[PDB]
Design a protein around this ligand. Structure first.
Ligand SMILES: CCCCCCCC/C=C/CCCCCCCC(=O)OC[C@H](COP(=O)(O)OCCN)OC(=O)CCCCCCC/C=C/CCCCCCCC
Ligand SMILES: CCCCCCCC/C=C\CCCCCCCC(=O)OC[C@H](COP(=O)(O)OCCN)OC(=O)CCCCCCC/C=C\CCCCCCCC
Ligand SMILES: CCCCCCCC/C=C\CCCCCCCC(=O)OC[C@H](COP(=O)(O)OCCN)OC(=O)CCCCCCC/C=C\CCCCCCCC
Lengths: 26, 717, 716
């Protein structure tokens, strides 16, 4: 579970759509 | 590893000084475990708890065993040797360990370590990136390298947002510096104070007379001079460490490391848009400047929106390949090759590499510049500008001046229209859709269409309250004036008299509520459209015999409830589009005009069709769709040129068999009627097919299966 | 790792000597820590605190305990043994550490470590670059050329970065100076104090109250060993001195802040390599000391001649001869064209191909044509657009015997070539670009007087006024076309001198009046006034004086009616009057029956008039887009018509005699109102389906035998 969490969180951290949704929010 | 860039010369100096100090600590420690002792000799004569110090010489006989001597050594070493001499190497080791922990606390503390590793990684990988050299040199770029460049730009932006919020790294470095300097002060104070207590000769008085026989002994500490020079060397090293620490503190406090000005890099390069980075980001960039200004110089190119704009344009040139543009090519209503560019960052250069393209469609393109590579676009004739603020290169401006012939401009703001459209000379078709009427910009912006000379089609969907004086100046050569106000009445004021060369006039959705006299003053018109002008009465058409050339009177989408008989004077009409009106009866005088070819009276209030329709032999497409016509007269089939009988949505009870005499019929619409059954003679039309014969399936089933086979074969063959 | 290039022989020697000195330092330190002791025996007979040195023998009974002996040893080792004999290995260790710190402060100081690492990376990248081999040879892949250009730019940026200041040279000089003075002090004090390491020591410490004896004689067992560890060490320092001294001489015999590439720029062809200076010069001198080949093959990245060679080689690999034949096209003159657009440089393979006839150079900057343009055989056209052409004297002389036609596209004076005036053997020339600038009214075209064989000059330069220089130049002119694109042309009767003109084109001159100078030239066969916005042609009465005009061109105008007098021009053979405002064309106008070509499309003709029957020596009539309903006997008295431009009309029918017109190249029917094609059109198998343009629904009404014959003749 720790490896799955860190893999998901790291791949989310380099996801462009995270920045896209942050721009949409703010 | 890669943290060396974040360690300036002071940090390296303290790192090496701490290493040498730890070597001193280890050496002193192993000597203290190994050969630290005190050779003690008793004083034979004592006087008030002190040694008296009062024929050949002979040695003094103490009568002590070797083990009594060892006991005396251990007791006096424990009791009367100063604590500094005993615990100097361990104190030095503790001090050096604390110094190393202070120098390496920010590397291990997760809150600062995450920021530090992010900074080091993205800064190093920006430093070895090739697009940094490409931008600082100011082509073609590899796909993988382009993906790396865009990912690095996004990572730099997200890290800049992530780091600038707080100043945890600056505060931690500050606190480490004050802790190190105050510990240096304490170390130097106590070590200098207690360094003189390391003595070779120690007088001990330990009260072990019951076990040995003597009370006071004079011991020699052998590792006292060696420990003294080791302590002096340690004091000198701590002095150097402390001086470096106060230099670091002065460097931190003299300037403001929380504020970086990029004025050196931004003025050197063409990028004047690099922001003044602040806070923690500014702090580690100052640290990198203490290492090497080149890293900051090559990193600053990733903080400017000009650089990312150029990168986006180059990447868009790269991704939009030629073959995908070939499969993107389409055709318009004018049978010209077409390419719709919708919602792109810029315009691809591979679009401009095309040669077969005729109409390029620029829709929602924010602030792009037209490259001169338009010299390749020789077949380009129609530039379609939708909400696109376009800047123009001079050779491309000349090329469009000598090639481009049709420009459509839609804009939301009157500043969005390019100012180089007036310099165009080969332009004939202009479509200015969007409000030209604004305060002090009401037709003053388009006052430069006087520079336009060959303009013949001027579409204006622009909510014009009154028609411009500039089109009164231009309309000597204008041949079509399509004005859409979407609900604003024109005060024409008979100003079209100077506009004599019009062949078509399309006043659509103008809410005129009456036909003005400017159309009547003109003479060259052949296609008159008055769509959605709310024309309640059209009684003026008696004067339309003055217009000897009119051939298409598109009086549709209006409030026309009747037709005056003077339309019989209009023998020159070929297409009379009266559909979607309120006309309830056709006068027979309208049926005098033998030249009518497209009699579209659909969506109206007609209840009957006069028989005189048989006189209209040139009629081809009679569309009476959605009317109240119950029975078609046989004389309707007298006209043998009916090509498309749109009888749909009517109340036709039965279609007579005389339709079998018609030959030009290609598509007849009967679905939605009261038609009981389809007669057999409907199959007698040769050119009619299933696509042409649109009808309900059960109505199709009424035809004979041999006639149905003929029609199904016309669908097949 | 990769720093071994920056360590010359002296640095390696000093590093090895420092390692050996550290070895003997730790050896002496281990000895001094572990078995350094002093065996002190009391002198039983003494004289004034000095050792007097005065039946089997018996041992001297000193009556001393073992611990009294240990105390005597400790006191006379601390008090009387010399400090050098006790702390020699620690001094050697400290000196060796100082020497190592001085040697490695070059690599450990960040300010110079960054520059050293950058220089190492750049030098190794240039060392492993394949293009250097080609640079030392006198084909490369796309990746090879791209990385060569990128590393060229990196070398230029590094040269800008490092040459500005000398921090590496200053630190190296300071390190050498410090090492030299440290060697001097070390040799001085070690030689002075090496004579105190003695085996025998007379100690007198005054511990008589604790031992009973005043003076003792002590043996220091390690002393002799320390002697062979001291003098040896001295010898090492001497070497470490002399080598360092040599290094100092190497930093003073010449200015290391001025590297000269004279040997390389003399041996190699590149003579443009600059004399680099400062830190760049110092590290290049160090690399020369290591290996001259690194500097030799790095010197080719400091010259712009090698940069130009790489650029031309890269563009040569881009555009091979096969891709040139791929890009080969043909123009309107049926000549071989090669559209070269947006290239950083001109190729050489494009001049290798002798087939080329029209060398096209559109918007190609930094153009410098080598004499390999002499390789071109059919070169008679040079379509240079927005091109600044530089041509050497042999290639210019080659142009002086083969070049014939030359088109220039320019933005005022910026893109106008200067070598065109010396060209005296060309025959055609074109110009395009605004010339009527402020204070420069037609002053830039004053150098076209040496051109004597020029015959064709065409201009499109939006002239507000007629240039007097043009009138002076045009003496030897045959064809001249003037395009003003919506600007007034003030001829002002100045064309009377232009007697040699045989074709005068005035496209979009917006004249609205025919200038009176046209009526003076008896050589003009073609008069072109297209898009002049002519409404009333009342100047054709004055055209009666001319007897040379064979074709008037008043098309794309608004001529409401053509007057009667124009029917007096028998020499007219081609009437281009299409897209005009002509309502009824008079029959008297068709008294001239030798109207071979005719353009009357897009007009307002309501019927084809009578004296078309008079016409006999024609080949086409353009009746597209007017109000004519039928092919009358008037068009049917013509027996030489070949193309009918009758499309998008209200033409009701084709009567029978058009089915006798077997020599019918084309018909145009793009929207005409024909009932059906008559069976008389089946009388002519000469007209094929590709030959005529007929609507698909109109074409299918022909009989199946006729349609099969039409498709057959399309195949046949
Ligand atoms: C605070 C952290 C410190 C870390 C400590 C590391 C481990 C310490 C434990 C040591 C493990 C085993 C070693 C014990 C050996 C004890 C033998 C002993 O005490 O015997 C007494 C007797 C007394 O010696 P004297 O000849 O009087 O010497 C007086 C000097 N003029 O000693 C002996 O007989 C032999 C001593 C054995 C020495 C062992 C240690 C030597 C260490 C080598 C030092 C390395 C020097 C490095 C460079 C020096 C500078 C150039
Ligand atoms: C700045 C902070 C300063 C810290 C220094 C504290 C000094 C306080 C002095 C206390 C004092 O004087 O009391 C005496 C007392 C000694 O008492 P006696 O021997 O009975 O008296 C001798 C007669 N003079 O002194 C002390 O306690 C000195 C304290 C020494 C502590 C030094 C730390 C030693 C800790 C050992 C751990 C290190 C191990 C390293 C691991 C090695 C791994 C390779
Ligand atoms: C001329 C320039 C001279 C350069 C040398 C500097 C010191 C000179 C000292 C002159 C002097 O008077 O010294 C006396 C003075 C007192 O001597 P005693 O033994 O009490 O009396 C001697 C009996 N005659 O002697 C000294 O202090 C010796 C000074 C030399 C210090 C030795 C070197 C210092 C550095 C030690 C390095 C430590 C590293 C340990 C790490 C080991 C590796 C794991």
């Amino acid at each position: 579970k720790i490896e799955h969490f860190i893999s998901i969180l790291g791949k989310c951290f380099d996801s462009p759509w995270t920045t896209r949704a942050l721009s949409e929010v703010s | 590893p890669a943290y060396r860039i974040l360690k300036p010369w002071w940090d390296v100096f303290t790192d090496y000084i701490s290493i040498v100090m730890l070597m001193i600590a280890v050496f002193g420690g192993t000597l203290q475990v190994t050969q630290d002792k005190m050779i003690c000799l008793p004083c034979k004569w004592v006087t008030k708890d002190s040694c008296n110090d009062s024929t050949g010489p002979t040695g003094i006989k103490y009568d002590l065993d070797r083990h009594q001597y060892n006991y005396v050594d251990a007791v006096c070493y424990e009791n009367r040797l100063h604590w500094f001499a005993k615990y100097f190497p361990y104190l030095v080791l503790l001090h050096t360990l604390i110094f190393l922990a202070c120098s390496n606390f920010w590397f291990k503390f997760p809150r600062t370590s995450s920021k530090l590793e992010h900074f080091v990684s993205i800064l190093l990988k920006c430093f070895d990136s090739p697009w940094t050299t490409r931008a600082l040199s100011e082509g073609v770029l590899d796909k993988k390298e382009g993906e790396q460049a865009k990912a690095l730009f996004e990572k730099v932006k997200k890290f800049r947002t992530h780091v600038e919020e707080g100043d945890i790294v600056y505060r931690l470095y500050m606190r480490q510096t004050i802790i190190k300097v105050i510990k240096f002060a304490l170390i130097i104070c106590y070590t200098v104070y207690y360094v003189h207590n390391i003595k070779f000769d120690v007088d001990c008085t330990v009260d072990i007379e019951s076990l040995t026989g003597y009370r006071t002994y004079r011991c020699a500490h052998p590792l006292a001079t060696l420990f003294k020079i080791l302590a002096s060397f340690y004091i000198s090293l701590v002095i150097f460490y402390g001086l470096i620490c106060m230099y670091t503190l002065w460097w931190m406090l003299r300037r403001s490391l929380k504020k970086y000005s990029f004025e050196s890099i931004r003025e050197e390069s063409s990028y004047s848009d690099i922001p003044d980075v602040k806070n923690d980001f500014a702090f580690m960039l100052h640290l990198i400047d203490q290492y090497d200004p080149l890293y900051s110089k090559r990193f600053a190119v990733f903080l400017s929106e000009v650089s990312e704009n150029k990168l986006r344009q180059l990447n868009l040139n790269n991704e939009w390949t030629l073959d995908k543009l070939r499969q993107r090519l389409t055709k318009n209503a004018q049978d010209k090759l077409e390419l719709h560019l919708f919602m792109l960052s810029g315009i691809p250069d591979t679009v401009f590499d095309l040669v077969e393209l005729e109409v390029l469609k620029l829709e929602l393109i924010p602030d792009v510049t037209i490259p001169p590579s338009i010299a390749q676009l020789t077949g380009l004739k129609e530039l379609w500008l939708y909400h696109t603020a376009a800047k123009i290169e001079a050779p491309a401006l000349a090329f469009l001046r000598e090639n481009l012939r049709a420009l459509h401009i839609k804009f939301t703001d009157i500043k969005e229209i390019p100012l180089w459209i007036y310099s165009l000379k080969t332009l004939e078709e202009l479509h200015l859709t969007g409000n030209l009427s604004a305060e002090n910009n009401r037709y003053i912006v388009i006052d430069g269409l006087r520079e336009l000379k060959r303009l013949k089609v001027l579409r204006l969907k622009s909510n014009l309250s009154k028609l411009p004086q500039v089109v009164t100046d231009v309309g000597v050569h204008l041949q079509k004036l399509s004005i859409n106000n979407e609900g604003t009445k024109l005060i024409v004021l008979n100003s079209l008299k100077k506009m004599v060369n019009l062949t078509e006039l399309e006043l659509i959705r103008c809410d005129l509520e009456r036909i003005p006299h400017s159309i009547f003053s003109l003479h060259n018109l052949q296609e008159i459209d008055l769509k959605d002008n709310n024309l309640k009465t059209i009684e003026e058409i008696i004067s339309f015999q003055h217009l000897h050339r009119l051939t298409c009177l598109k009086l549709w989408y209006n409030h026309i409830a009747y037709i005056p008989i003077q339309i019989g004077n209009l023998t020159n009409l070929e297409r009379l589009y009266l559909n979607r009106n309120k006309i309830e009866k056709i006068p027979t005088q309208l049926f005098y005009c033998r030249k009518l070819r497209y009699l579209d009276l659909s969506h109206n209030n007609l209840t009957f069709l006069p028989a005189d329709i048989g006189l209209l032999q040139n009629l081809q497409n009679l569309a009476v769709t959605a009317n109240r016509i119950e029975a078609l007269p046989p004389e309707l089939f007298q006209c043998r040129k009916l090509r498309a009988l749109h009888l749909g949505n009517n109340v036709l009870q039965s279609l007579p068999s005389r339709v079998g005499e018609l030959t030009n019929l290609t598509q007849i619409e009967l679905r939605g009627n009261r038609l009981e059954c389809l007669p057999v003679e409907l199959g007698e039309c040769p050119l009619l097919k299933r696509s042409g014969l649109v009808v309900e399936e059960d109505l199709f089933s009424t035809l004979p299966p041999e006639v149905k086979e003929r029609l199904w074969r016309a669908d097949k063959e």
